[PDB]
Symmetry: D2
Subunit: 256 residues, 4 copies
């Protein structure tokens, strides 16, 4: 259907939102590179999704790994039509406990990883002369700061800015750069996230995750399936005029 014969690469797609996007894209006729640092699980996820999906080992913190992931897409799929920068790390600390290690690690994956993957995808798309779709994964966190989330908020704000900058620079090549800003999405990560808020806000385990879910205007915590519609749309021809946008898909958590 909507992505018929398109070749996609989704960073960090072995599980969670990225794997949901990869399954949605295969259903819509795309060939999909399940790019992940977890090459074992990616190989698993590709085998389960079907012949249209194939595993690619990728660490977005390393230039050589980014360049070999793109080349791998050219090898298997004939080229690259759609990049989703999905790989991300979360962290939480009050200002006076923020570590250089936290700053370096989250900026390396969330910003540099996105920026240099986007740059390598753009180079391939410019060389093909057929245009392209790039979708960055932002967050409600990139829309506004939080006392305890300065580092991840800042990374996601840099993503929104990069989305804007790259979108204006690459549209002359018929490459659309846009971003999705999820709200709060349910899954295994919330054990960590809830723990981190629990400690600093002094809460019973699971309280944070309960309150956050109940405060989503829509009435529940997000699923990956909430986001797959937008992911297909922004990779499809029905989004050709859409440039340098961040679209919140977040049950009303943040209004942009």
């Amino acid at each position: 259907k909507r992505l018929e014969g398109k070749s996609a690469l989704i960073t960090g797609s072995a599980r969670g939102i990225g794997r949901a996007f990869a399954e949605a894209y295969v259903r819509e006729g795309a060939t999909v590179a399940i790019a992940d640092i977890d090459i074992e699980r990616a190989r698993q996820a590709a085998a389960e999704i079907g012949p249209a999906a194939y595993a690619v080992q990728m660490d977005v913190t390393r230039q050589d790994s980014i360049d070999a992931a793109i080349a791998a897409t050219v090898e298997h799929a004939g080229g690259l039509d759609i990049l989703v920068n999905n790989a991300a790390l979360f962290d939480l600390a009050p200002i006076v406990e923020i570590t250089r290690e936290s700053y370096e690690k989250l900026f390396a994956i969330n910003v540099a990883g996105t920026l240099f993957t986007l740059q390598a995808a753009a180079r391939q798309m410019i060389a093909q002369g057929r245009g392209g779709k790039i979708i960055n994964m932002a967050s409600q966190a990139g829309r506004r700061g939080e006392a305890l989330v300065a580092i991840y908020c800042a990374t996601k704000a840099a993503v929104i800015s990069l989305t804007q900058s790259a979108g204006l620079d690459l549209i002359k090549h018929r490459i659309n750069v846009n971003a999705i800003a999820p709200g709060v999405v349910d899954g295994e990560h919330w054990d960590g996230v809830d723990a981190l808020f629990a400690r600093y806000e002094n809460r019973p385990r699971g309280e944070k995750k309960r309150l956050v879910g109940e405060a989503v205007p829509f009435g529940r915590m997000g699923t990956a399936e909430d986001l797959t519609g937008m992911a297909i749309f922004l990779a499809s021809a029905e989004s050709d005029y859409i440039v340098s946008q961040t679209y919140n898909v977040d049950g009303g958590n943040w209004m942009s």
Copy 2:
């Protein structure tokens, strides 16, 4: 396809963007009330589009007209699933030449018309108990002021706000309220728009329209067909988690 069995009303839909949306909605399986003050052209538009499109006489500045248009939808289509608030009026004047007539006429159509049609559709949607989709038509003008466009900018700014408020208030009824913000769209209206800039900015006729089209990062003035994908998406199930958003579909003219 994506709006199979749905009942929609698009205000001001005899011409331009609204008619484009009605044709797209019809092609996606919707029944569409082509609502316009211009009942003659609505009748012509519905006849060309097909059996699924039907003409409704509507002046969004009058409560009795709004209420009769919604009732007419219940009569013909069995109910209302989708409202597109498309009817709007443009004007331009420096601050010192703004007239109470310009203020009253633009606020009546662009704000009161959208608000009270949204209210009437919401009331019908709540009574049905099947949830709903409301799509307001904002504009780049609602994202930021312009020296010469204080009234229209203010009206579209009010629309973005109303979209946010109504979205939070109505999502407990499973009614999604969102908005589309076009940039500059080609069509008959630019005679008026260029003429108004031409005067105040002291330009040959057709210059403003030309410069504005060439300044769109995408590389051209918009069409109604740039917007139809978003119109369908925000009326469809693939947008169910999206609440109180304004989405720019504008070739990069404004980055939100």
Copy 3:
């Protein structure tokens, strides 16, 4: 000191924030017109503030009242250098209970009153050829919608838009148009505001006012004296380069 010899008019300044601005302006050596619909509370306010304050009857919904106030200002003070558009009305109701009466009342005062008072001060300031300072009173309400507060949020959204448009059009006359967005500010008005939230959110009286004050990141409900710094600053020569901005003074309630 910083407004020595300057002629100001503050709309709705017999009480609350407007009156705190008039006292601060007089302290800084401005002559101030205490414009109010209540001419008796104005005369009181002017008697108490001192000889540099003087009472002007003004209905900002009436063009004749607007022009008569500016003329009175010119007659008494030799002209007008600072306008503060402080006259506003609050109201609250969910979408399905919004009345045309609420819509019309809040837009007439909050939007038309600001726009046509701004327009009348601009004409006067242009004729004088000495430039000017115009300060619009926005709100956190103008920064984002709320389920219960569609009409008042929409009016404050239009004020921010109008502040942008007028700022751009009027700067060539050396008139600085900017706005202040308070968050929650204490005063007699909060009895009314809490009562509305109490009624429609079904709360004990004073619970909303208490919760609202405690959620301010700064840690308290704001005072008018929190805002007087910015009100002086934006009418002083230290803000000459500041154009078409809304500045939140809100203890962190909204981040812009």
Copy 4:
């Protein structure tokens, strides 16, 4: 004398906007640490500004240099009441020519430098128990992306994000964290900025600088003296209620 007896440190303040801030703070009765990587231009700046200014060698990319600078400030002035994060580096390049060297250098100074200097100042201000004032230097660049300026735009976007997060976390210690966003500001740096744009947009030298100055709605390129008003205000008691805001002082270049 609005900053009477206050201890300030301004990063990168030997020249340009930082130096203007140091002179203005001294005029207002502050003691000011002229922190710069160039200790010679720091000493010369401090000698010229007068006895209340003193030179501090500081590399904001190095934690040991950061901590040694805060120490020197406590040593000389008795403590730290005001931090201005002014040290920044500009660079320009389209997406496909962005180097890892440009990314790393601009993020180290513009983001890490601001964050870790803010953290070192915060710890000192908390230990003191007297509250304090932190002012980050943002930019128009941080408010929206540009095709050629992805890296610098992204760093300034992260500064606005960090300003929001820090402000919310530190207001409980009576530390106000806010930011100033200049538009285009004159100085010896604009030879370098114009040259980069001349290079990558293929323009005669000085055309960019001229065009950007003429596009400021106010009608000229900004001066550092345009910004000192706000730099004093945000460090003074008239801004005590102002938390997590970015204030554009840009002649209307960007409207927030």
